[PDB]
Design a protein around this ligand. Structure first.
Ligand code: HEM
Ligand SMILES: C[C@@H](C(=O)Nc1ccc(Cl)cc1)[C@H]1CC[C@H](c2ccnc3ccc(F)cc32)CC1
Length: 358
């Protein structure tokens, strides 16, 4: 499906991403690289304002353009937030502004650190002929020390990658539908569910690598989309495609409704690469797997469909426990409306659960 920029092995994630910019952008790299210390000390802001307005042109191809969105990305948040206690003032200088606001409008992304940046493009396997495991993976850019931004980015990543096993049968699904192949479609739906259960195991690792109290107080403030004030020019899991992909594959209508829950999810598409946005919709353009599976009156097909929905609902429900442990509890011990959030996340679990057909 490579015109949508999906990869057999590594899903929506950018495969084997650039980790060296050109030389002309050695200025940029050596802020971003040594960024735990520039924030800690305070000589980050210093060093950004004491810089020049580099052109984006020398960035040739995609992989290189995207690394640039990352480097500029971590720099922007770190600059604007600072140490993340009071200093959060003062809009970016036009040194970093125009590149980011140029390169963002080029790659059709927002001028802001997104999932596509800080997870998808933000990794490398250390020993190039070793497997996609936690040992043999590391991120390109952290923010502080003990922000657990390695564990976080990489567990996030490894889920995209488990999902990649399911995503890659989806043509087999739509193929076997139009060509009236019950047996083919049936296996294809058990494959998906059997992979989406695999996706939950990877998810368990979050406990192991990401520290609860660390994440809340330290790291999340730099991924907080539009907290603060941009003040530049004319005006992060859950920006993931993985969940909305299979929302749509299984004809589960989240974004259909007159509700906040729904519109939030459809807005999240604007934080995705354009190619993924494109992909998602293509799925919607296709005949409904849900409606098809219903018409046939085939007990074993509903079973294999209900298995994919089970699998999703499973993921969503676990996701909540993770939020309890990594937001709610930590959020308490931190000297009104509060958590409508858990409403939101349930409202979406709920809606997925409703799409079961016994
Ligand atoms: C410490 C780890 C995580 C925490 C604390 C967390 C927290 C949250 C929260 C609070 C939301 C609601 C909107 C918001 O972000 O403000 C959210 C939404 C979401 N998160 Fe996460 N998340 C985590 C990891 C993940 C991972 C690894 C994935 C996928 C690989 C994921 C997938 C989603 C999705 C798809 C949504 C949109 C709502 C939905 O589809 O149900 N999250 N997350
Ligand atoms: C930052 C917020 C926001 O403000 N939105 C917003 C949307 C539109 C507009 Cl116009 C303004 C703001 C919104 C919620 C806080 C952030 C957040 C919270 C809790 N857990 C997280 C876990 C991982 C992660 F990556 C981010 C997490 C994410 C983005």
């Amino acid at each position: 499906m490579k015109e949508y920029h999906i990869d057999e092995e590594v899903g929506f994630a950018l495969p084997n991403p650039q980790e060296n910019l050109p030389d002309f952008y050695n200025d940029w790299m050596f802020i971003a690289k040594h960024l735990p210390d520039l924030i800690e000390s305070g000589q980050l802001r210093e060093r950004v304002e004491k810089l020049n307005m580099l052109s984006i042109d020398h960035l040739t191809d995609h992989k290189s353009q995207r690394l640039a969105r990352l480097v500029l990305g971590c720099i922007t948040m770190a600059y604007v937030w600072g140490k993340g206690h009071g200093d959060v003032r003062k809009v970016l200088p036009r040194n970093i502004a125009v590149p980011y606001c140029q390169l963002s409008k080029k790659l059709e992304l927002p001028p802001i650190l997104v999932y596509a940046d800080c997870v998808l493009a933000n990794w490398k396997k250390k020993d190039p002929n070793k497997p996609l495991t936690y040992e043999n993976m590391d991120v390109l850019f952290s923010f502080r020390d003990g922000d657990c931004s390695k564990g976080f980015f990489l567990v996030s990543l490894l889920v995209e990658i488990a999902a990649a096993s399911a995503i890659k049968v989806i043509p087999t699904v739509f193929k076997a539908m139009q060509m009236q192949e019950r047996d083919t479609l049936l296996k294809a739906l058990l494959e998906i569910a059997s992979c989406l259960e695999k996706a939950l195991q990877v998810f368990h690792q979050i406990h192991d690598h990401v520290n609860p109290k660390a994440f809340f107080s330290v790291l999340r403030i730099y991924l907080s989309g539009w907290k603060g004030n941009p003040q530049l020019s004319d005006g992060s899991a859950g920006q993931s495609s993985v969940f909305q992909c299979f929302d749509v594959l299984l004809g589960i209508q989240q974004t259909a409704g007159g509700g906040h829950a729904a519109q939030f999810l459809q807005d999240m598409r604007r934080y995705m690469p354009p190619a993924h946005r494109n992909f998602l919709c293509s799925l919607e353009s296709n005949p409904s797997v849900r409606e098809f599976v219903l018409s046939k009156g085939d007990a074993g097909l509903r079973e294999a469909y209900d298995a994919c929905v089970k699998a999703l609902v499973s993921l969503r429900s676990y996701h909540l426990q993770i939020v309890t442990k990594y937001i709610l509890i930590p959020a308490s011990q931190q000297p009104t409306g509060g958590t409508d959030l858990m409403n939101f996340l349930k409202t979406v679990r709920s809606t997925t659960e409703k799409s079961l057909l016994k």
